[PDB]
Amino acid sequence: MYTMGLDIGSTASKGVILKNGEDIVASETISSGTGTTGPSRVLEKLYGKTGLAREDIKKVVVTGYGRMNYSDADKQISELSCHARGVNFIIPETRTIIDIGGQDAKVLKLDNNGRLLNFLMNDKCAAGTGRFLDVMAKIIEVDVSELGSISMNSQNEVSISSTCTVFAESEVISHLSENAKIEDIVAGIHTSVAKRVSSLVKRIGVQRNVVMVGGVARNSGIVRAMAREINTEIIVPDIPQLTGALGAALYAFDEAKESQ
């Protein structure tokens, strides 16, 4: 009936209280992490605006970098598991999450309940990840966040052959030398990364709803390319900081249920 979720970074602490797995009754965030007052201060804020007693919280689950440091807790669950679980709380019927990171990319398949089932990670190749985008940006002397908008007014599209990052880093200088329209080039870089991650998506199997996450997911152009490529509408929602603790309160709630 009343469960708690804690997420303890190294730089921040976050917590959620959740009635009947349906109602966030309180939430808090503090800019202090593992080994500080931060997590204590989250609890005060939660217990104080609710008026509840420790006996009222049936289960606590904690996640985050410092989750192994924290004792008064019924369970420790991964941030990957937890975080996703919260994302589905935000967009129900989510079954496929796409996290293009700065140095990695992961596709996650989920339960009818929003619980991680299996997933694929790329951490070894620079292509089809964030850094692929740093590189190309530096070459045409532009800022990475300025990128998604340039690509809007594409008229043709610079098609690339190179799949490797290095090779490609030449191939755009060759298109640059000729002096093609940047909205054509940026459209063909986006297509690169899109084609890459698409393969991971292909292997794991699409199944809507399909949500996109990460810093890279704000690049509107990457999102379109990705959509066109997997052939499915893609949701890019706004995910709040307290999404990890949220997922934890949810797991802390499957758990309260099983005691009975």
Q: Which residues are annotated as a binding site for ATP?
A: 10-14, 102-104, 134, 215, 241
Q: Cα separations (Å) of 91 from 1, 84, 184, 242?
A: 22, 10, 33, 15
Report if residue 127 touches ligand SF4, rule: CB under 6 A: yes
By beta-carbon proximity to ligand SF4, the closer residue of 23 and 123 is: 123
Residue of 203, 21, 194, 238 lying closest to 115 (CA atoms): 21
Please tell me whether residue 139 binds ligand SF4 under the rule CB under 6 A. Answer: no
Binding mask 164-183 for ligand SF4 (x = CB under 6 A): xxx-----------------
CA proximity to 111, closest of 238, 254, 1: 254
Query: Residue 232's Cα: distance from chain center in Å?
Result: 19
Task: Read off the DSSP letter of residue 235.
Answer: B
Distance CA 250, CA 94 (A): 15
Instruction: Please report how close the Cβ of residue 185 comes to its own copies at its closest, in angstroms.
Output: 20
Considering the complex, state which of residue 126 and residue 235 has its C-beta at the smaller distance from its own copies: 126
Q: Is 125 in the site for ligand SF4 (CB under 6 A)?
A: yes
Please state the residue numbers annotated as binding site. 10-14, 102-104, 125, 134, 164, 215, 241
Report whether 63 contacts 78 (CB < 8 A): yes
Contact call for residue 103 and ligand SF4 (CB under 6 A): no
Q: Does the footprint of ligand SF4 cover residue 121 (CB under 6 A)?
A: no
Encoded one letter per residue, x for contact with ligand SF4 by CB under 6 A and - for no contact, window 180-209 reads ------------------------------
**Which residues would be at the binding site for its own copies (CB under 8 A)?**
103, 124-126, 131, 135, 163-167
Cα–Cα distance for residue pair 105/99, rounded to 1 Å: 6
Q: Which does 103 bind (CB under 5 to 8 A by kind): ligand SF4, its own copies, none?
A: its own copies
Contacts 24+ apart (CB under 8 A), 25-29: 25/50, 26/50, 27/242, 27/245, 27/246, 28/242, 29/241, 29/242
Interacting residue ranges for ligand SF4, rule: CB under 6 A: 125-127, 164-166
